[PDB]
Short mmCIF file of C-alpha atoms in Angstrom, two decimals:
data_model
loop_
_atom_site.label_atom_id
_atom_site.label_comp_id
_atom_site.label_asym_id
_atom_site.label_seq_id
_atom_site.Cartn_x
_atom_site.Cartn_y
_atom_site.Cartn_z
CA UNK A 52 95.50 117.36 68.36
CA UNK A 53 98.01 116.33 71.04
CA UNK A 54 97.52 116.86 74.80
CA UNK A 55 99.84 118.56 77.27
CA UNK A 56 99.78 115.82 79.90
CA UNK A 57 98.67 112.18 79.97
CA UNK A 58 97.76 110.50 83.26
CA UNK A 59 99.83 107.42 82.40
CA UNK A 60 101.59 105.78 79.46
CA UNK A 61 98.31 104.10 78.51
CA UNK A 62 96.34 107.35 78.52
CA UNK A 63 93.75 105.43 80.53
CA UNK A 64 91.92 105.89 83.84
CA UNK A 65 93.69 103.68 86.38
CA UNK A 66 91.84 102.57 89.51
CA UNK A 67 93.72 102.03 92.81
CA UNK A 68 93.39 98.80 94.81
CA UNK A 69 91.40 100.55 97.54
CA UNK A 70 88.58 101.52 95.17
CA UNK A 71 88.41 98.10 93.47
CA UNK A 72 88.23 96.25 96.78
CA UNK A 73 85.47 98.46 98.16
CA UNK A 74 83.68 98.19 94.81
CA UNK A 75 83.71 94.39 94.89
CA UNK A 76 82.65 94.55 98.54
CA UNK A 77 79.57 96.62 97.72
CA UNK A 78 78.81 94.61 94.57
CA UNK A 79 78.64 91.38 96.58
CA UNK A 80 75.90 92.79 98.79
CA UNK A 81 74.23 94.80 96.03
CA UNK A 82 74.07 92.16 93.28
CA UNK A 83 75.68 88.82 94.23
CA UNK A 84 73.97 88.24 97.58
CA UNK A 85 71.49 91.16 97.46
CA UNK A 86 70.35 93.03 100.54
CA UNK A 87 66.72 94.02 100.01
CA UNK A 88 66.83 97.21 102.10
CA UNK A 89 70.54 97.94 102.04
CA UNK A 90 72.22 100.81 103.87
CA UNK A 91 75.80 101.72 102.93
CA UNK A 92 77.55 104.09 105.35
CA UNK A 93 81.16 104.89 106.25
CA UNK A 94 81.61 106.23 109.78
CA UNK A 95 84.50 108.15 111.30
CA UNK A 96 85.88 106.76 114.54
CA UNK A 97 88.79 104.93 116.14
CA UNK A 98 89.83 101.34 115.53
CA UNK A 99 90.59 99.57 118.81
CA UNK A 100 93.01 96.68 119.33
CA UNK A 101 91.24 94.28 121.70
CA UNK A 102 94.56 93.30 123.30
CA UNK A 103 95.82 96.80 124.14
CA UNK A 104 92.39 98.47 124.31
CA UNK A 105 93.94 101.47 122.57
CA UNK A 106 93.94 102.64 118.96
CA UNK A 107 95.02 99.88 116.59
CA UNK A 108 98.71 100.03 115.69
CA UNK A 109 100.02 98.70 112.40
CA UNK A 110 103.44 99.28 110.79
CA UNK A 111 101.91 100.91 107.71
CA UNK A 112 102.12 104.44 106.33
CA UNK A 113 98.84 104.79 104.45
CA UNK A 114 95.09 104.11 104.49
CA UNK A 115 94.86 100.33 104.79
CA UNK A 116 91.94 97.91 104.40
CA UNK A 117 92.29 95.10 106.93
CA UNK A 118 91.25 91.54 106.17
CA UNK A 119 87.90 90.41 107.64
CA UNK A 120 89.88 87.90 109.73
CA UNK A 121 91.05 90.92 111.74
CA UNK A 122 87.51 92.03 112.55
CA UNK A 123 87.38 89.35 115.24
CA UNK A 124 90.49 90.86 116.85
CA UNK A 125 89.55 94.55 116.77
CA UNK A 126 86.77 96.85 117.95
CA UNK A 127 85.44 100.07 116.43
CA UNK A 128 84.39 103.08 118.51
CA UNK A 129 82.03 105.22 116.44
CA UNK A 130 82.39 108.07 118.93
CA UNK A 131 84.19 111.40 118.65
CA UNK A 132 84.97 114.33 120.95
CA UNK A 133 82.72 117.39 120.98
CA UNK A 134 85.72 119.48 119.95
CA UNK A 135 86.48 117.25 116.96
CA UNK A 136 82.77 117.27 116.10
CA UNK A 137 82.48 121.07 116.17
CA UNK A 138 85.66 121.43 114.10
CA UNK A 139 84.16 119.17 111.45
CA UNK A 140 80.86 121.03 111.79
CA UNK A 141 82.40 124.42 110.99
CA UNK A 142 84.43 122.99 108.12
CA UNK A 143 81.31 121.50 106.52
CA UNK A 144 79.37 124.76 106.87
CA UNK A 145 82.20 126.56 105.09
CA UNK A 146 82.18 123.97 102.30
CA UNK A 147 78.40 124.39 102.19
CA UNK A 148 78.74 128.12 101.55
CA UNK A 149 81.45 127.75 98.91
CA UNK A 150 79.23 125.33 97.00
CA UNK A 151 76.63 128.07 96.61
CA UNK A 152 79.01 130.07 94.41
CA UNK A 153 78.30 130.30 90.66
CA UNK A 154 79.69 127.33 88.75
CA UNK A 155 79.56 125.00 91.74
CA UNK A 156 77.28 122.03 92.38
CA UNK A 157 75.30 123.24 95.45
CA UNK A 158 75.22 121.56 98.85
CA UNK A 159 71.85 120.62 100.33
CA UNK A 160 71.24 121.19 104.04
CA UNK A 161 68.76 119.51 106.37
CA UNK A 162 68.77 119.78 110.16
CA UNK A 163 66.55 117.36 112.08
CA UNK A 164 65.89 116.95 115.80
CA UNK A 165 64.29 113.57 116.42
CA UNK A 166 63.57 110.95 119.09
CA UNK A 167 64.63 107.31 118.82
CA UNK A 168 62.51 104.71 120.59
CA UNK A 169 63.54 101.05 120.80
CA UNK A 170 60.95 98.33 121.30
CA UNK A 171 61.40 94.66 122.19
CA UNK A 172 60.33 91.91 119.79
CA UNK A 173 58.13 88.81 119.96
CA UNK A 174 67.22 92.65 118.36
CA UNK A 175 64.82 95.60 118.60
CA UNK A 176 62.46 97.77 116.55
CA UNK A 177 63.55 101.39 116.15
CA UNK A 178 60.96 104.15 115.85
CA UNK A 179 61.90 107.69 114.85
CA UNK A 180 59.68 110.70 115.54
CA UNK A 181 60.20 114.46 115.51
CA UNK A 182 60.80 116.11 118.88
CA UNK A 183 58.39 118.90 117.95
CA UNK A 184 55.19 117.21 116.75
CA UNK A 185 55.91 113.53 117.51
CA UNK A 186 54.95 112.37 114.01
CA UNK A 187 56.53 109.03 113.10
CA UNK A 188 59.36 109.50 110.60
CA UNK A 189 60.44 105.87 110.34
CA UNK A 190 59.98 102.43 111.89
CA UNK A 191 62.61 99.86 110.97
CA UNK A 192 64.55 96.85 112.20
CA UNK A 193 68.25 97.26 111.45
CA UNK A 194 70.47 94.24 110.77
CA UNK A 195 74.27 94.35 110.49
CA UNK A 196 75.36 92.51 107.34
CA UNK A 197 79.09 93.10 106.80
CA UNK A 198 81.90 95.49 107.74
CA UNK A 199 85.11 96.78 106.18
CA UNK A 200 87.67 98.36 108.50
CA UNK A 201 90.17 100.94 107.28
CA UNK A 202 93.19 101.76 109.45
CA UNK A 203 94.34 105.34 108.83
CA UNK A 204 97.68 106.00 110.58
CA UNK A 205 98.10 109.46 109.05
CA UNK A 206 94.83 110.77 110.46
CA UNK A 207 93.06 111.11 113.80
CA UNK A 208 90.21 108.91 112.59
CA UNK A 209 89.87 105.37 111.29
CA UNK A 210 86.86 104.32 109.23
CA UNK A 211 84.30 101.53 109.35
CA UNK A 212 82.44 100.80 106.12
CA UNK A 213 79.25 99.04 107.14
CA UNK A 214 76.57 97.30 105.11
CA UNK A 215 73.20 97.08 106.85
CA UNK A 216 69.58 96.09 106.25
CA UNK A 217 66.91 98.57 107.33
CA UNK A 218 63.89 96.26 107.31
CA UNK A 219 60.73 98.42 107.47
CA UNK A 220 58.32 96.90 109.97
CA UNK A 221 54.90 98.02 111.21
CA UNK A 222 54.42 100.24 114.26
CA UNK A 223 54.53 98.32 117.57
CA UNK A 224 51.42 98.01 119.75
CA UNK A 225 50.01 101.20 121.25
CA UNK A 226 50.43 99.80 124.76
CA UNK A 227 53.99 98.48 124.55
CA UNK A 228 56.62 100.69 126.20
CA UNK A 229 59.97 101.47 124.51
CA UNK A 230 62.96 99.70 126.07
CA UNK A 231 65.21 102.69 125.38
CA UNK A 232 64.79 106.33 124.37
CA UNK A 233 67.50 108.59 122.98
CA UNK A 234 67.44 112.06 121.45
CA UNK A 235 69.28 112.68 118.19
CA UNK A 236 70.43 115.91 116.56
CA UNK A 237 71.13 115.27 112.88
CA UNK A 238 72.80 117.81 110.61
CA UNK A 239 72.68 116.45 107.07
CA UNK A 240 74.71 117.76 104.15
CA UNK A 241 73.90 116.45 100.67
CA UNK A 242 76.23 116.85 97.69
CA UNK A 243 75.96 114.91 94.43
CA UNK A 244 73.46 112.55 96.09
CA UNK A 245 76.11 111.71 98.68
CA UNK A 246 74.96 112.24 102.25
CA UNK A 247 77.10 113.60 105.09
CA UNK A 248 75.42 113.35 108.50
CA UNK A 249 76.65 114.99 111.69
CA UNK A 250 74.83 113.09 114.43
CA UNK A 251 74.64 114.09 118.09
CA UNK A 252 73.04 111.55 120.43
CA UNK A 253 72.22 112.04 124.12
CA UNK A 254 72.03 108.83 126.14
CA UNK A 255 70.26 108.59 129.49
CA UNK A 256 70.83 105.90 132.09
CA UNK A 257 69.13 104.99 135.39
CA UNK A 258 72.57 104.86 137.03
CA UNK A 259 75.26 106.67 135.02
CA UNK A 260 75.41 110.37 134.16
CA UNK A 261 73.92 111.37 130.81
CA UNK A 262 76.43 111.13 127.97
CA UNK A 263 76.31 112.76 124.54
CA UNK A 264 78.07 110.96 121.70
CA UNK A 265 79.15 112.62 118.46
CA UNK A 266 79.19 110.89 115.08
CA UNK A 267 79.86 111.60 111.42
CA UNK A 268 79.03 109.34 108.50
CA UNK A 269 79.03 109.40 104.72
CA UNK A 270 76.14 107.66 102.99
CA UNK A 271 75.02 106.84 99.45
CA UNK A 272 71.85 108.82 98.76
CA UNK A 273 70.90 106.98 95.57
CA UNK A 274 70.88 103.24 96.28
CA UNK A 275 68.85 102.44 93.16
CA UNK A 276 71.50 104.06 90.97
CA UNK A 277 74.39 102.55 92.91
CA UNK A 278 72.72 99.17 92.40
CA UNK A 279 72.49 99.80 88.66
CA UNK A 280 76.16 100.76 88.43
CA UNK A 281 77.19 97.73 90.48
CA UNK A 282 75.06 95.59 88.16
CA UNK A 283 77.12 96.71 85.16
CA UNK A 284 80.31 96.00 87.12
CA UNK A 285 79.13 92.43 87.61
CA UNK A 286 78.27 92.31 83.91
CA UNK A 287 81.56 93.69 82.59
CA UNK A 288 81.66 97.49 82.47
CA UNK A 289 82.76 98.67 85.92
CA UNK A 290 83.72 102.29 85.23
CA UNK A 291 80.62 104.06 86.62
CA UNK A 292 80.77 102.03 89.85
CA UNK A 293 84.46 102.86 90.29
CA UNK A 294 83.81 106.57 89.83
CA UNK A 295 80.93 106.57 92.29
CA UNK A 296 82.95 104.69 94.91
CA UNK A 297 85.98 106.91 94.27
CA UNK A 298 83.82 110.01 94.76
CA UNK A 299 82.33 108.49 97.91
CA UNK A 300 85.72 107.54 99.35
CA UNK A 301 87.34 110.87 98.42
CA UNK A 302 84.68 112.81 100.34
CA UNK A 303 85.42 110.46 103.24
CA UNK A 304 89.15 111.17 103.01
CA UNK A 305 88.57 114.93 103.12
CA UNK A 306 86.51 114.72 106.32
CA UNK A 307 88.84 112.22 107.97
CA UNK A 308 91.82 114.53 107.40
CA UNK A 309 89.94 117.47 108.88
CA UNK A 310 91.26 117.61 112.45
CA UNK A 311 92.68 120.47 114.52
CA UNK B 128 79.46 127.45 84.47
CA UNK B 129 77.57 124.54 86.03
CA UNK B 130 79.35 121.19 85.44
CA UNK B 131 77.83 117.70 85.42
CA UNK B 132 80.01 116.25 88.17
CA UNK B 133 82.68 117.34 90.65
CA UNK B 134 85.68 115.33 91.85
CA UNK B 135 84.51 115.85 95.44
CA UNK B 136 82.39 118.24 97.52
CA UNK B 137 85.34 120.63 97.80
CA UNK B 138 85.79 120.65 94.02
CA UNK B 139 89.52 120.44 94.80
CA UNK B 140 92.05 117.78 93.74
CA UNK B 141 92.36 115.15 96.48
CA UNK B 142 95.61 113.25 96.90
CA UNK B 143 95.60 109.76 98.50
CA UNK B 144 97.88 108.89 101.43
CA UNK B 145 100.30 106.81 99.35
CA UNK B 146 101.17 109.69 97.03
CA UNK B 147 101.62 112.00 100.02
CA UNK B 148 103.91 109.62 101.90
CA UNK B 149 106.04 108.93 98.83
CA UNK B 150 106.18 112.65 98.03
CA UNK B 151 107.37 113.45 101.54
CA UNK B 152 109.86 110.61 101.26
CA UNK B 153 111.30 112.10 98.07
CA UNK B 154 111.21 115.65 99.45
CA UNK B 155 113.23 114.57 102.49
CA UNK B 156 116.04 113.36 100.21
CA UNK B 157 115.76 116.11 97.61
CA UNK B 158 115.31 119.21 99.76
CA UNK B 159 115.44 118.47 103.50
CA UNK B 160 118.70 116.52 103.51
CA UNK B 161 119.53 116.27 99.78
CA UNK B 162 121.31 113.15 98.61
CA UNK B 163 124.07 114.25 96.25
CA UNK B 164 124.20 112.62 92.80
CA UNK B 165 120.80 111.16 93.60
CA UNK B 166 119.13 108.30 91.75
CA UNK B 167 115.42 107.63 92.33
CA UNK B 168 114.38 104.19 91.09
CA UNK B 169 111.38 101.94 91.72
CA UNK B 170 111.91 98.22 91.07
CA UNK B 171 109.24 95.57 90.68
CA UNK B 172 110.05 92.44 92.65
CA UNK B 173 109.23 90.28 95.65
CA UNK B 174 109.31 91.44 99.26
CA UNK B 175 110.75 88.65 101.41
CA UNK B 176 109.97 88.14 105.10
CA UNK B 177 113.28 87.08 106.64
CA UNK B 178 111.55 84.85 109.19
CA UNK B 179 109.31 82.91 106.81
CA UNK B 180 111.99 83.23 104.12
CA UNK B 181 109.10 83.48 101.65
CA UNK B 182 107.09 86.36 100.21
CA UNK B 183 105.87 88.79 102.87
CA UNK B 184 102.29 88.15 103.99
CA UNK B 185 99.99 90.75 105.51
CA UNK B 186 96.31 90.78 106.56
CA UNK B 187 95.73 93.76 104.26
CA UNK B 188 93.77 94.00 101.02
CA UNK B 189 95.48 96.88 99.22
CA UNK B 190 98.79 98.51 98.29
CA UNK B 191 100.59 99.07 101.59
CA UNK B 192 103.66 101.16 102.39
CA UNK B 193 105.61 99.68 105.30
CA UNK B 194 107.09 101.44 108.32
CA UNK B 195 110.91 101.70 108.29
CA UNK B 196 111.26 99.21 111.18
CA UNK B 197 110.28 96.42 108.78
CA UNK B 198 113.21 97.16 106.46
CA UNK B 199 115.55 95.50 108.96
CA UNK B 200 113.50 92.30 109.13
CA UNK B 201 112.68 91.92 105.44
CA UNK B 202 114.62 91.77 102.17
CA UNK B 203 113.80 92.49 98.54
CA UNK B 204 114.28 90.45 95.36
CA UNK B 205 114.28 92.45 92.12
CA UNK B 206 114.79 89.28 90.07
CA UNK B 207 111.73 87.98 88.21
CA UNK B 208 111.22 85.01 85.89
CA UNK B 209 111.99 85.18 82.17
CA UNK B 210 108.36 84.45 81.28
CA UNK B 211 107.25 87.37 83.45
CA UNK B 212 109.94 89.52 81.86
CA UNK B 213 108.83 88.51 78.37
CA UNK B 214 105.19 89.14 79.25
CA UNK B 215 106.07 92.64 80.42
CA UNK B 216 108.32 93.12 77.39
CA UNK B 217 105.48 92.35 74.97
CA UNK B 218 103.10 94.55 76.94
CA UNK B 219 105.46 97.52 76.74
CA UNK B 220 105.97 96.97 73.01
CA UNK B 221 102.22 97.25 72.42
CA UNK B 222 102.06 100.35 74.62
CA UNK B 223 104.98 101.64 72.55
CA UNK B 224 103.14 101.08 69.27
CA UNK B 225 99.91 102.55 70.63
CA UNK B 226 101.61 105.77 71.77
CA UNK B 227 102.58 106.45 68.16
CA UNK B 228 98.92 106.76 67.18
CA UNK B 229 97.72 110.27 66.32
CA UNK B 230 96.58 112.13 69.44
CA UNK B 231 98.90 110.32 71.83
CA UNK B 232 102.16 111.27 73.51
CA UNK B 233 104.86 109.12 71.86
CA UNK B 234 107.07 106.59 73.63
CA UNK B 235 110.83 106.81 73.14
CA UNK B 236 112.89 103.66 72.60
CA UNK B 237 116.51 102.97 73.52
CA UNK B 238 118.18 99.55 73.63
CA UNK B 239 121.69 99.51 75.08
CA UNK B 240 124.01 96.53 75.48
CA UNK B 241 126.70 97.18 78.08
CA UNK B 242 129.35 95.61 80.30
CA UNK B 243 129.73 96.31 84.02
CA UNK B 244 133.19 95.96 85.57
CA UNK B 245 133.55 96.02 89.36
CA UNK B 246 136.80 97.06 91.06
CA UNK B 247 137.69 97.28 94.76
CA UNK B 248 138.23 100.24 97.10
CA UNK B 249 139.44 100.81 100.66
CA UNK B 250 133.76 99.72 101.64
CA UNK B 251 132.01 99.22 98.30
CA UNK B 252 132.90 98.58 94.66
CA UNK B 253 133.56 100.85 91.69
CA UNK B 254 131.28 100.21 88.72
CA UNK B 255 132.70 100.91 85.26
CA UNK B 256 130.13 100.73 82.46
CA UNK B 257 131.22 100.21 78.86
CA UNK B 258 129.43 99.34 75.62
CA UNK B 259 129.87 95.85 74.20
CA UNK B 260 130.29 97.06 70.62
CA UNK B 261 132.97 99.76 70.75
CA UNK B 262 134.08 98.96 74.31
CA UNK B 263 133.94 102.68 75.14
CA UNK B 264 133.59 103.78 78.77
CA UNK B 265 130.14 105.19 79.56
CA UNK B 266 130.25 105.67 83.33
CA UNK B 267 132.50 105.14 86.35
CA UNK B 268 130.63 105.49 89.62
CA UNK B 269 130.54 104.56 93.29
CA UNK B 270 126.93 103.76 94.14
CA UNK B 271 125.61 103.97 97.69
CA UNK B 272 122.17 102.99 98.98
CA UNK B 273 120.65 105.75 101.10
CA UNK B 274 116.98 104.99 101.74
CA UNK B 275 114.24 102.52 100.80
CA UNK B 276 110.44 102.53 100.75
CA UNK B 277 108.69 99.19 100.44
CA UNK B 278 105.23 98.72 98.97
CA UNK B 279 103.53 95.40 99.70
CA UNK B 280 101.03 94.52 96.98
CA UNK B 281 98.85 91.54 98.02
CA UNK B 282 96.72 91.73 94.87
CA UNK B 283 99.61 91.59 92.42
CA UNK B 284 102.45 89.20 91.62
CA UNK B 285 105.01 91.94 92.24
CA UNK B 286 106.00 94.10 95.20
CA UNK B 287 107.70 97.49 94.87
CA UNK B 288 110.92 98.99 96.22
CA UNK B 289 111.53 102.72 95.95
CA UNK B 290 115.23 103.32 96.55
CA UNK B 291 117.26 106.51 96.97
CA UNK B 292 120.93 106.23 96.01
CA UNK B 293 124.10 108.31 95.89
CA UNK B 294 125.69 107.58 92.51
CA UNK B 295 129.06 109.30 92.99
CA UNK B 296 131.19 109.61 89.83
CA UNK B 297 134.81 108.75 90.59
CA UNK B 298 138.17 108.33 88.86
CA UNK B 299 138.88 105.34 86.62
CA UNK B 300 140.70 102.54 88.49
CA UNK B 301 144.40 101.80 87.98
CA UNK B 302 144.80 100.41 84.45
CA UNK B 303 146.88 97.50 85.69
CA UNK B 304 144.18 96.52 88.19
CA UNK B 305 141.71 93.80 87.23
CA UNK B 306 137.94 93.83 87.85
CA UNK B 307 136.67 91.73 90.76
CA UNK B 308 133.39 91.02 88.98
CA UNK B 309 132.26 91.19 85.35
CA UNK B 310 128.67 91.03 84.11
CA UNK B 311 126.85 91.81 80.87
CA UNK B 312 123.80 94.05 80.97
CA UNK B 313 121.16 94.22 78.25
CA UNK B 314 118.77 97.13 78.71
CA UNK B 315 115.57 98.01 76.85
CA UNK B 316 114.54 101.53 77.81
CA UNK B 317 111.18 103.17 77.22
CA UNK B 318 110.60 106.86 77.90
CA UNK B 319 107.19 108.48 78.25
CA UNK B 320 106.63 111.99 79.62
CA UNK B 321 110.20 111.96 80.94
CA UNK B 322 109.49 108.82 82.93
CA UNK B 323 111.95 106.04 82.17
CA UNK B 324 110.97 102.36 82.17
CA UNK B 325 113.95 100.00 81.89
CA UNK B 326 113.75 96.26 81.23
CA UNK B 327 117.06 94.67 82.17
CA UNK B 328 118.69 91.29 81.60
CA UNK B 329 121.97 90.72 83.44
CA UNK B 330 124.03 87.63 82.60
CA UNK B 331 126.54 86.67 85.27
CA UNK B 332 128.98 83.94 86.28
CA UNK B 333 130.26 82.02 89.28
CA UNK B 334 133.31 79.78 89.91
CA UNK B 335 131.24 77.18 91.78
CA UNK B 336 127.50 77.34 91.11
CA UNK B 337 125.69 77.24 87.78
CA UNK B 338 124.11 80.68 87.53
CA UNK B 339 121.48 82.27 85.29
CA UNK B 340 120.75 85.70 83.87
CA UNK B 341 118.39 87.75 86.02
CA UNK B 342 115.46 89.86 84.87
CA UNK B 343 114.48 93.27 86.22
CA UNK B 344 111.99 96.05 85.53
CA UNK B 345 112.49 99.50 87.01
CA UNK B 346 110.85 102.90 86.73
CA UNK B 347 112.98 106.03 86.99
CA UNK B 348 112.54 109.81 86.91
CA UNK B 349 113.86 111.37 83.70
CA UNK B 350 114.55 114.96 84.73
CA UNK B 351 115.85 114.74 88.29
CA UNK B 352 116.33 118.52 88.38
CA UNK B 353 112.66 119.15 87.63
CA UNK B 354 111.69 116.69 90.37
CA UNK B 355 113.86 118.74 92.74
CA UNK B 356 112.19 122.00 91.74
CA UNK B 357 108.70 120.59 92.25
CA UNK B 358 109.76 119.19 95.63
CA UNK B 359 111.12 122.63 96.54
CA UNK B 360 107.73 124.16 95.78
CA UNK B 361 106.00 121.51 97.90
CA UNK B 362 108.28 122.29 100.84
CA UNK B 363 107.33 125.96 100.40
CA UNK B 364 103.60 125.22 100.42
CA UNK B 365 102.64 124.53 96.80
CA UNK B 366 102.55 120.73 96.74
CA UNK B 367 100.37 120.25 93.66
CA UNK B 368 103.05 119.99 90.94
CA UNK B 369 105.06 117.45 92.96
CA UNK B 370 101.94 115.36 93.64
CA UNK B 371 100.95 115.15 89.96
CA UNK B 372 104.45 113.96 89.10
CA UNK B 373 104.60 111.31 91.83
CA UNK B 374 101.03 110.29 90.99
CA UNK B 375 102.03 109.83 87.34
CA UNK B 376 105.12 107.91 88.46
CA UNK B 377 103.25 105.55 90.77
CA UNK B 378 100.41 105.09 88.26
CA UNK B 379 102.89 103.85 85.68
CA UNK B 380 104.37 101.62 88.38
CA UNK B 381 100.85 100.36 89.11
CA UNK B 382 100.11 99.44 85.49
CA UNK B 383 103.29 97.39 85.06
CA UNK B 384 102.89 95.68 88.43
CA UNK B 385 99.38 94.53 87.51
CA UNK B 386 100.66 93.03 84.26
CA UNK B 387 101.12 89.28 84.72
CA UNK B 388 100.03 86.15 82.86
#
């Protein structure tokens, strides 16, 4: 009853620093100082050095989590070229098809075309409706809680891990006009309750030409369960939280590395 | 054949950046421009910023491999404290005893007590290694540093240096020539899955200053030929067997590095 290979001389699952740090990060805003309507999402983009106004440069060789004291010195563009976006789009569709094979855990697909309306308050209230029948999908007030920035010198994309609060508020008055209106094309892939959204947003302006920004983000689709796992981590047993984070971050790594 | 969970949405093994960088680093000195008589060793220690003259500090929150440009403005100290060495020694002994349990892959144990004599050449030194007991010559080599990878570890008490060396075997020095330096070297070696972990005490002397014995812990590849073969496959496309080996290597390095009182 002896194995062929052991993963280490302890024959134990070892967790890298990256996973532990992100795990403690989430646990702080899941259990320690709880966010009532939390939204955890990692976005692909470029990290910008505020001094050079170009992509952040650091003498490192691997995926690196910066200290929060560097957040004040950098900026994060959540944008992406149409070419990069399409390349990721095709890759994901291929992965989607392969997951339909026998023995695989299937991908879920959901394509939405919706309108975002922003209303002033008495910060803004965001209202989401379908472009087709104008039925209200959601009406929230989003608050930025905390951010974790990952510099990725080996890839074409850096990553921002954001924690937010989507406070559900009532529909604004029927006579108030939206401050801003933007169309959004959202291609959502779901695998193991982990969400992968390809978002395409057209922005109109009274002066500038219309621009269309491209985004990709990975999101936890089961907050209640992630909360439960993070609870145990706070208690003592932190294995299921580590695995969930590791799975989350590994999906992120795959997408990030996917560039022409 | 529906499983409960998958490692990722690709259902394929995903290798982190660190393993990939280190693998490429090894491949460059095993296949691309092969160092002859190569010795791959990773030492726990302390990365020193030459400017601050203290331990390197970085606004990062995880294991970080430095660019090469830093190697000329930082230095490394492989010497740790005796209490740290003892703490690691006891930890390895328990891991040793646990690996003998049924179902596990056994540790191997090897404790050597040797003497290192250093002679001059015309520029490095020639190292002659002999046992203390029978005073029999074990090795006679000219060692040359070739390349270094530095891993800053802000969460642990130890940093990591991965060095590549040319350990050229040479002729024994002239019998009537005396050693320039003489030091005793106690070594406790553990071997698991052909990965060598060596605890080392080295007592030394000095004409002027009172000196002490230093303490070191290093991790080394057992079968250097197998590491070459895997690296050859990786260069030819199939990188998986090299990755698993480097992963296993670094994981063992991780465990020891995180072991501190």
